[PDB]
Design an enzyme around this catalytic site. Structure first.
Site, PDB file in Angstrom:
ATOM      1  N   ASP B 127      27.051  11.999 -19.747  1.00  0.00           N
ATOM      2  CA  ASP B 127      25.700  10.889 -20.051  1.00  0.00           C
ATOM      3  C   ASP B 127      25.193  10.635 -21.730  1.00  0.00           C
ATOM      4  O   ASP B 127      23.599  11.166 -21.479  1.00  0.00           O
ATOM      5  CB  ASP B 127      25.527  12.308 -19.248  1.00  0.00           C
ATOM      6  CG  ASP B 127      25.277  11.651 -17.771  1.00  0.00           C
ATOM      7  OD1 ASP B 127      26.270  11.940 -17.257  1.00  0.00           O
ATOM      8  OD2 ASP B 127      24.681  10.138 -18.228  1.00  0.00           O
ATOM      9  N   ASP B 156      29.419   8.343 -18.764  1.00  0.00           N
ATOM     10  CA  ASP B 156      28.792   7.452 -19.387  1.00  0.00           C
ATOM     11  C   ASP B 156      28.798   7.259 -20.410  1.00  0.00           C
ATOM     12  O   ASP B 156      27.590   8.250 -21.089  1.00  0.00           O
ATOM     13  CB  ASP B 156      26.917   8.501 -18.545  1.00  0.00           C
ATOM     14  CG  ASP B 156      27.018   7.299 -17.215  1.00  0.00           C
ATOM     15  OD1 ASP B 156      28.050   7.185 -16.788  1.00  0.00           O
ATOM     16  OD2 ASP B 156      25.965   7.632 -16.269  1.00  0.00           O
ATOM     17  N   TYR B 159      25.633   3.348 -22.531  1.00  0.00           N
ATOM     18  CA  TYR B 159      24.924   2.675 -21.742  1.00  0.00           C
ATOM     19  C   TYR B 159      24.389   1.168 -22.610  1.00  0.00           C
ATOM     20  O   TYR B 159      23.479   0.366 -22.550  1.00  0.00           O
ATOM     21  CB  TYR B 159      22.948   3.128 -21.937  1.00  0.00           C
ATOM     22  CG  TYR B 159      23.620   5.041 -21.423  1.00  0.00           C
ATOM     23  CD1 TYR B 159      23.523   5.909 -21.901  1.00  0.00           C
ATOM     24  CD2 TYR B 159      23.061   4.902 -19.836  1.00  0.00           C
ATOM     25  CE1 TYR B 159      24.314   7.059 -20.530  1.00  0.00           C
ATOM     26  CE2 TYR B 159      23.150   5.654 -19.137  1.00  0.00           C
ATOM     27  CZ  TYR B 159      23.453   7.568 -19.855  1.00  0.00           C
ATOM     28  OH  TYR B 159      23.725   8.090 -18.893  1.00  0.00           O
ATOM     29  N   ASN B 193      29.751   5.328 -14.661  1.00  0.00           N
ATOM     30  CA  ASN B 193      29.563   4.019 -13.625  1.00  0.00           C
ATOM     31  C   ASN B 193      28.813   3.317 -14.457  1.00  0.00           C
ATOM     32  O   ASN B 193      28.973   1.706 -14.697  1.00  0.00           O
ATOM     33  CB  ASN B 193      28.048   3.956 -12.180  1.00  0.00           C
ATOM     34  CG  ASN B 193      27.051   5.045 -12.970  1.00  0.00           C
ATOM     35  OD1 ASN B 193      27.331   6.535 -13.715  1.00  0.00           O
ATOM     36  ND2 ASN B 193      25.652   4.866 -12.909  1.00  0.00           N
ATOM     37  N   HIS B 194      28.222   3.704 -15.614  1.00  0.00           N
ATOM     38  CA  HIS B 194      27.718   2.842 -16.596  1.00  0.00           C
ATOM     39  C   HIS B 194      28.641   2.069 -17.393  1.00  0.00           C
ATOM     40  O   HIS B 194      28.872   1.150 -18.301  1.00  0.00           O
ATOM     41  CB  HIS B 194      26.605   2.972 -17.561  1.00  0.00           C
ATOM     42  CG  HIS B 194      25.763   3.562 -17.070  1.00  0.00           C
ATOM     43  ND1 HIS B 194      24.673   3.042 -17.878  1.00  0.00           N
ATOM     44  CD2 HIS B 194      24.775   4.271 -17.033  1.00  0.00           C
ATOM     45  CE1 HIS B 194      23.371   3.027 -16.839  1.00  0.00           C
ATOM     46  NE2 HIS B 194      23.325   4.191 -17.016  1.00  0.00           N
ATOM     47  N   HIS B 278      32.247  12.371 -12.737  1.00  0.00           N
ATOM     48  CA  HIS B 278      30.747  11.632 -13.406  1.00  0.00           C
ATOM     49  C   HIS B 278      29.844  12.263 -12.506  1.00  0.00           C
ATOM     50  O   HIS B 278      29.142  12.649 -12.109  1.00  0.00           O
ATOM     51  CB  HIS B 278      30.464  10.688 -12.689  1.00  0.00           C
ATOM     52  CG  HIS B 278      29.710   9.979 -13.975  1.00  0.00           C
ATOM     53  ND1 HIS B 278      28.765  10.641 -15.236  1.00  0.00           N
ATOM     54  CD2 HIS B 278      28.256   9.195 -13.605  1.00  0.00           C
ATOM     55  CE1 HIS B 278      28.156   9.781 -15.541  1.00  0.00           C
ATOM     56  NE2 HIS B 278      27.516   9.023 -14.171  1.00  0.00           N
ATOM     57  N   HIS B 287      17.583  12.435  -7.868  1.00  0.00           N
ATOM     58  CA  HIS B 287      18.676  11.461  -8.217  1.00  0.00           C
ATOM     59  C   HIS B 287      19.218  11.929  -7.812  1.00  0.00           C
ATOM     60  O   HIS B 287      20.010  12.764  -8.055  1.00  0.00           O
ATOM     61  CB  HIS B 287      17.969  11.397 -10.254  1.00  0.00           C
ATOM     62  CG  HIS B 287      18.435  10.319 -10.375  1.00  0.00           C
ATOM     63  ND1 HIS B 287      19.475  10.065 -11.594  1.00  0.00           N
ATOM     64  CD2 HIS B 287      17.934   9.523  -9.853  1.00  0.00           C
ATOM     65  CE1 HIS B 287      19.185   8.804 -12.121  1.00  0.00           C
ATOM     66  NE2 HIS B 287      18.974   8.392 -11.498  1.00  0.00           N
ATOM     67  N   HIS B 288      19.839  10.461  -7.271  1.00  0.00           N
ATOM     68  CA  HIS B 288      21.472  10.762  -6.637  1.00  0.00           C
ATOM     69  C   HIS B 288      21.398  11.171  -6.148  1.00  0.00           C
ATOM     70  O   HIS B 288      23.343  11.458  -5.727  1.00  0.00           O
ATOM     71  CB  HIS B 288      22.284  10.962  -7.844  1.00  0.00           C
ATOM     72  CG  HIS B 288      22.641   9.826  -9.002  1.00  0.00           C
ATOM     73  ND1 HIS B 288      22.172   8.004  -8.223  1.00  0.00           N
ATOM     74  CD2 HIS B 288      22.080   9.856 -10.153  1.00  0.00           C
ATOM     75  CE1 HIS B 288      22.120   7.939  -9.955  1.00  0.00           C
ATOM     76  NE2 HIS B 288      22.500   8.614 -12.014  1.00  0.00           N
ATOM     77  N   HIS B 315      26.139  12.422 -14.166  1.00  0.00           N
ATOM     78  CA  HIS B 315      25.243  11.361 -13.696  1.00  0.00           C
ATOM     79  C   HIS B 315      23.654  11.982 -13.126  1.00  0.00           C
ATOM     80  O   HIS B 315      22.971  11.316 -13.291  1.00  0.00           O
ATOM     81  CB  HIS B 315      26.291  11.386 -12.595  1.00  0.00           C
ATOM     82  CG  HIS B 315      26.115  10.164 -12.324  1.00  0.00           C
ATOM     83  ND1 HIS B 315      25.458   8.582 -11.790  1.00  0.00           N
ATOM     84  CD2 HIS B 315      25.453   9.554 -10.594  1.00  0.00           C
ATOM     85  CE1 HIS B 315      25.620   7.964 -11.152  1.00  0.00           C
ATOM     86  NE2 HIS B 315      25.534   8.367 -10.116  1.00  0.00           N
ATOM     87  N   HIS B 317      20.985  13.781 -15.020  1.00  0.00           N
ATOM     88  CA  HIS B 317      20.278  13.801 -16.144  1.00  0.00           C
ATOM     89  C   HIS B 317      19.528  15.550 -16.404  1.00  0.00           C
ATOM     90  O   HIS B 317      18.270  14.173 -16.470  1.00  0.00           O
ATOM     91  CB  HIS B 317      19.418  12.372 -16.934  1.00  0.00           C
ATOM     92  CG  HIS B 317      20.477  11.554 -16.795  1.00  0.00           C
ATOM     93  ND1 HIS B 317      19.662   9.829 -17.075  1.00  0.00           N
ATOM     94  CD2 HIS B 317      21.433  11.360 -16.431  1.00  0.00           C
ATOM     95  CE1 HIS B 317      20.504   8.675 -16.776  1.00  0.00           C
ATOM     96  NE2 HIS B 317      22.025  10.147 -16.595  1.00  0.00           N
TER      97      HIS B 317
HETATM   98 FE   LIG Z   1      23.975   8.987 -16.370  1.00  0.00          FE
HETATM   99 ZN   LIG Z   2      26.156   8.195 -14.224  1.00  0.00          ZN
END
Ligand SMILES: [Fe+3]
Ligand SMILES: [Zn+2]
Ligand SMILES: *[C@@H]1O[C@H](CO)[C@@H](O)[C@H](O)[C@H]1NC(C)=O
Ligand SMILES: *[C@@H]1O[C@H](CO)[C@@H](O)[C@H](O)[C@H]1NC(C)=O
Ligand SMILES: *[C@@H]1O[C@H](CO)[C@@H](O)[C@H](O)[C@H]1NC(C)=O
Ligand SMILES: *[C@@H]1O[C@H](CO)[C@@H](O)[C@H](O)[C@H]1NC(C)=O
Ligand SMILES: *[C@@H]1O[C@H](CO)[C@@H](O)[C@H](O)[C@H]1NC(C)=O
Ligand SMILES: *[C@@H]1O[C@H](CO)[C@@H](O)[C@H](O)[C@H]1NC(C)=O
Ligand SMILES: *[C@@H]1O[C@H](CO)[C@@H](O)[C@H](O)[C@H]1NC(C)=O
Ligand SMILES: *[C@@H]1O[C@H](CO)[C@@H](O)[C@H](O)[C@H]1NC(C)=O
Ligand SMILES: *[C@@H]1O[C@H](CO)[C@@H](O)[C@H](O)[C@H]1NC(C)=O
Ligand SMILES: *[C@@H]1O[C@H](CO)[C@@H](O)[C@H](O)[C@H]1NC(C)=O
Ligand SMILES: [Fe+3]
Ligand SMILES: [Zn+2]
Lengths: 424, 424
Positions: B127, B156, B159, B193-194, B278, B287-288, B315, B317
């Site tokens: 990330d 990631d 970005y 995913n990014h 990820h 988050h997630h 994934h 952060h």
């Molecule tokens: Fe990320």
């Molecule tokens: Zn991610």
């Protein structure tokens, strides 16, 4: 138990470059387009289609496109896909195919215009294959007194991949086999695992290849970027088709599409919300027990949240019906990992018992859990007869029974217009 | 908080058609091949690479291939990917790139031959992005006294997709940004995913496009049919890389590959078994929270069964470490849906805190559940220092701390050679 090649069912229409394997499906989002697909084996031929309505016999011509593919040491004939569009609703249409050499005539009837109380009756067949059993199902459906008008096909079409090098001839036989039904009424297609055909050994590594060349869908009508998931509105139902073997990760295209699509559903316009998939989310048989778990952990809430009515799957060669049940409470450490009755949840039905290669899955988990409303290991097909915006009557005919014997039967109360407990 | 375009870090090497964005990775399965990748912006240029070993300065040339892609109203420069192979183990190599006009020299060192007790130290970064924070992490890693020799990149990358039309320039800046590290030591790539970049609106609908053109992997070395999942053996570790946003359905190619691959692992040859992904399977932040569920329901058992040592993800952060825990007992109605300590299960670590666009995920579930061994919302990177076939020492340096301060630290006992409780 697969019907042999000579089988009368697999016979090739006589005539030089006689359009064979004719098969149709909905070509647009709401019903006024058809996709005619066939195969010519002698030479390319014309991808034009002649059609006209019974009433106004003004014959018109639609031109399609022709393609071919090689599988391993296999080579398709000439595949054709033409899309007739702007049809009138509720109208018998006549279409001829194979204009250059030997022409064949067929007919289909556009469905009624999308509506709140527009009845329609869908047949459910999944996991067909080409065993004798399959023949039988197809005929039982062909005769169900309440006559089906469109077949929702839940996956696993021909099992050609069981043959060596997936002998694609078995794809040609199947196409011919099912013509008697599909050349006259659309079958909505769903990608099953047997469709994947990932065969690295024989250097075939593009998932769904033969399937994708032979069977086309109006995926672009919804705003899908792939034929493996799409939706169609027909009569009063809104049908969403998903792909168990495609990807559903958060952010992936199928995931992204399904979310948005669910928001585009208008129950005031299409009261019945049906979802199709191959691997079942709720299943109590031993075979494939718990495979739907992953896709479940991803889409269940959405289904409950939007109050989808039914969810049909195949993959388990047998039959099963459930209680309107959810299991969307688990948060890892909180122990709430047990299915509860929930009346916003859909009824999950699985009908992968149309025949396959003549083998039924009978081993089931003892004892039948609460969520499971009714289950049986018999070959058969189903019918989902929409009546009003409130009523729809599902049925399940066993192959053992006579054509009109409903081995199982259930009234569906519209999760949106008439949410009363239809559970038992 | 993304470093602006002028940033000294994003500066373009002077020279006409000066190979920029140089970056390398393992080119084969066991260590004696490298994939050199760079970009020329003025004109195509030569995809040849000049290289030689420090000792035997016999300069040799490898020829690669050049490609370009368009994103929306974007147009890449000329991307080049050449694979040097048959290198000698443990050897400093010098390679020059940009032979036609302005040549740039670099060096990398082949790793040691695969072995039972061969130590090696991996850096874990996930990330990254291109905020100032990212700059900082990269430098902290660049200075960790135990010096990393390969970076396992958990997803990631840049970005760029946060920018409008995913302004691919941000892919070019990132490439230049990270050059200082990657042009000299391989980074093992993982699709985040990014990276997907599914942008129908701007008519970009081929997942992972920019990513795939810029970053290549020896997927064919394992027998993967896609760059999104593969494995590499290096030093003493066996690394499997998976794709959270690709498909893992039963029968799908990733599924099929991972299964077989796990059977190909030889602990007598590569004691350390590491898996990369990820989206994390075990995560206690808000988050997630619970996204890994699906892939979990599919691969956990396998991991426990093969005794994988660690599993790194990004994934989220922030940082988190777990107890060797499994949760492979649930069978729907039996209520066994709660994580238990299991010493055959791997330690799931998540390090998606290298920077991103300068934002940390701090909201976590109160209270920290049993499975969670240690968690903190700080920016940082990690190191996984393999010592023997029994010992490997993980560390976690916070960006706030000084370069050598291990904000968290743990000794790993080899699930295979020395399965003793390393839990705390
Ligand atoms: Fe990320
Ligand atoms: Zn991610
Ligand atoms: C394909 O190859 C198999 C053996 O590999 C052979 O038996 C079969 O007849 C071949 N089919 C064709 C159409 O050549
Ligand atoms: C097929 O159609 C073409 C044109 O209509 C004709 O010339 C040809 O002789 C026909 N018969 C065969 C066997 O191709
Ligand atoms: C299949 O069924 C049809 C009628 O349903 C029958 O005419 C045909 O002979 C059957 N063929 C086989 C191989 O079962
Ligand atoms: C075809 O057969 C196998 C499948 O992996 C392999 O030995 C061979 O490299 C494959 N590919 C080609 C191009 O022959
Ligand atoms: C719905 O159909 C049922 C029979 O299936 C009927 O008894 C009921 O009155 C109908 N509802 C409406 C609004 O007509
Ligand atoms: C791409 O289009 C945007 C607006 O749509 C514009 O502002 C930007 O400068 C364009 N970039 C290029 C390279 O043309
Ligand atoms: C680049 O290299 C070619 C051949 O080496 C040379 O002719 C050319 O003038 C050089 N300079 C530029 C700016 O292209
Ligand atoms: C990034 O860090 C390097 C050293 O780590 C420093 O020389 C450079 O100025 C920094 N640039 C920015 C924009 O932080
Ligand atoms: C491009 O922009 C949007 C994306 O869906 C749409 O209006 C248009 O049809 C797209 N495709 C093309 C070829 O313009
Ligand atoms: C493993 O390394 C540790 C220190 O990390 C050391 O104390 C131990 O004796 C080593 N084991 C072997 C077999 O050398
Ligand atoms: Fe099946
Ligand atoms: Zn199946």
């Amino acid at each position: 138990r697969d019907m042999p090649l000579d089988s009368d069912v697999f016979r090739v229409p006589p005539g030089y470059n006689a359009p064979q394997q004719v098969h149709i499906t909905q070509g647009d989002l709401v019903g006024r387009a058809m996709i005619i697909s066939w195969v010519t084996m002698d030479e390319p031929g014309s991808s034009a289609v002649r059609y006209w309505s019974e009433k106004n016999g003004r014959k018109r011509i639609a031109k399609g496109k022709m393609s071919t593919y090689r599988f391993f040491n296999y080579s398709s004939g000439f595949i054709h896909h033409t899309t007739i569009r702007k049809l009138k609703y509720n109208t018998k249409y006549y279409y001829e195919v194979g204009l250059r050499n030997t022409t064949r005539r067929f007919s289909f009837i556009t469905p009624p215009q999308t509506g709140l109380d527009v009845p329609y009756t869908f047949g459910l067949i999944g996991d067909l294959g080409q065993s004798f059993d399959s023949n039988t199902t197809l005929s039982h459906y062909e005769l169900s007194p309440k006559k089906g008008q469109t077949v929702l096909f839940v996956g696993d079409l021909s099992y050609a991949d069981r043959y060596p090098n997936h002998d694609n001839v078995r794809w040609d036989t199947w196409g011919r086999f099912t013509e008697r039904s599909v050349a006259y009424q659309p079958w909505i297609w769903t990608a099953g695992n047997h469709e994947i055909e990932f065969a690295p050994e024989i250097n075939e590594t593009e998932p769904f290849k033969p399937f994708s060349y032979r069977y086309h869908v109006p995926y672009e009508a919804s705003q899908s970027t792939s034929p493996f998931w799409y939706s169609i509105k027909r009569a009063s139902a809104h049908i969403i088709v998903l792909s168990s073997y495609s990807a559903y990760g958060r952010g992936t295209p199928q995931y992204t599409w399904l979310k948005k699509e669910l928001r585009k559903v208008k129950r005031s316009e299409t009261p019945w919300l049906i979802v199709l998939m191959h691997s079942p989310l709720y299943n109590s048989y031993n075979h494939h027990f718990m495979e739907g778990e992953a896709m479940r952990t991803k889409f269940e809430a959405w289904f409950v949240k939007y109050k989808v009515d039914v969810v049909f799957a195949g993959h388990v060669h047998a039959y099963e019906r459930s209680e309107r049940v959810s299991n969307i409470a688990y948060k890892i450490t909180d122990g709430l990992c047990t299915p509860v009755k929930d009346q916003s949840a859909p009824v999950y039905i699985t009908i992968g018992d149309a025949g396959n290669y003549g083998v039924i899955d009978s081993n089931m988990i003892q004892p039948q859990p609460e969520y499971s409303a009714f289950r049986e290991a018999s070959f058969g097909h189903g019918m989902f007869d929409i009546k009003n915006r409130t009523h729809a009557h599902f049925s399940w005919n066993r192959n053992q029974d006579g054509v009109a014997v409903e081995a199982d039967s259930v009234w569906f109360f519209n999760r949106h217009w008439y949410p009363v407990d239809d559970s038992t």
